[PDB]
Write a protein that binds this ligand. Structure first.
Ligand SMILES: [K+]
Ligand SMILES: [K+]
Lengths: 264, 251
């Protein structure tokens, strides 16, 4: 019943600070152990990004990045999610025992993703992305798309309670469109598919600050979106600062449950 | 429209360190500094010996000053110096003269729920009744209705269950239309939200949770130890509520 805390484990070569000195399985294991200790329920491993202007890699390459890391941590007492939009990458990871496939394309890139996730009795996160030049209201477009994709997921045999929806904050959306989405999370929660909110250190949180910040300085306004989102009913949050959010979410979860209990 | 951040400045057993802490709190985003000389029985003179030197030093700063006192002699001395708010843990029950003193200086007063531990009626109803009665007393002394704050008094004269009832029903207190100051920071309630015997500082995140939660219920200020954490989080919640209003054409 708790809000799930999904930590971020980025394994793309370029995201590494010290020239990639610590871009290996052993470093990833130290990081994951820290995130588990701070309260992470899920570790989101990703080696690709669907953002425009990014590196375009092969399935073999993505597998090179993700497989060794997944194998090393899948045995830990934490759930494992993989950010991938290609079913071949998903299947290899599912065979290694991952729990969730976080598809930044909501199965739009590769429709086999649905039967692949279902074949392994896993969960799938469908993120709203693309169609940035849409002419209709973003939340309507988002709901139409995500609901069509979730329906495809159910057809493949994926249970409704194992199909997550993610607004895709940070992807194919203007500042106006993101403001609209953040104001209507209740509508997304109303679909009854568990909702994953992922705003951590992105432009939206960057612009909630009154000055230019380094990513880490956006942690408190990210926690604000976490608390707000839980109040709206989102079921999980994807964050960089696992501890802050884990402890804050424990508080909000407590307060909401206490409130429901006391109003029967 | 922003939620006001009231930073806590406990001065119970020197000015230099008090001023330093106030300097930090202003930086971290504090709108009000609440100076407290009675940890809660020291004499009025002893309370004044603690509080006064500090108030004399920080009252000229660009920040509102609140004094945590329930005795009118302490309040008056501070008000003469120019403080803005009297935060009364007894809601004027300890010293009936508190309201005349506050009225005299045209300052604000926070009426905190306290006492009557062996209450007859359910806590929320008893709280409302006591606080509204005291608000009435404050007004007939000449204090403007818009300068009266209500504080649920978390940490005082309530069992664990009663405080949980109060925290589950903040909207009913916010509904009185008097601005509400939520003061949970590091108190037993937050410790127990953590679920084990934590140190005071370890309760800062669950305290920030009561802050966000409280803002969503409409409280207008939060009294906190960790000013920076709550200031940034409160700022974020304020932005999200206003954005939600904007996109829906609410208010
Ligand atoms: K596992
Ligand atoms: K001042």
């Amino acid at each position: 019943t708790k809000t799930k805390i999904m930590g971020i484990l980025n394994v793309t070569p370029d995201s590494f600070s010290d020239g990639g000195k610590f871009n290996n399985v052993e470093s990833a294991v130290t990081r994951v152990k820290a995130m588990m200790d701070e309260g992470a329920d899920i570790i989101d491993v990703g080696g690709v990004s669907t953002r425009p202007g990014h590196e375009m890699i092969t399935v073999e390459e993505e597998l090179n990045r993700v497989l060794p890391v997944v194998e090393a941590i899948v045995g830990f007492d934490v759930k494992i999610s993989v950010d991938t939009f290609r079913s071949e990458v998903a299947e290899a990871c599912l065979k290694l025992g991952v729990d969730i496939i976080n598809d930044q394309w909501a199965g739009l890139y590769d429709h086999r993703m649905f039967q692949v996730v279902a074949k392994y009795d896993a969960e799938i996160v469908l993120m709203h992305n693309g169609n940035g030049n849409r002419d209709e209201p973003v939340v309507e477009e988002m709901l139409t798309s995500l609901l069509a994709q979730a329906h495809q997921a159910k057809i493949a045999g994926i249970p409704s309670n194992k199909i997550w929806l993610d607004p895709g904050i940070g992807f194919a959306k203007t500042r106006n469109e993101e403001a609209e989405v953040m104001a209507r999370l209740d509508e997304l929660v109303a679909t009854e598919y568990p909702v994953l909110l992922a705003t951590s250190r992105k432009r939206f949180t960057k612009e909630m600050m009154g000055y230019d910040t380094t990513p880490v300085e956006r942690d408190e306004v990210t926690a604000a979106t976490t608390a707000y989102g839980i109040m709206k009913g989102v079921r999980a949050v994807r964050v960089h600062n696992v501890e802050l959010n884990a402890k804050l979410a424990k508080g909000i979860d407590f307060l909401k449950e206490n409130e429901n209990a006391r109003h029967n």
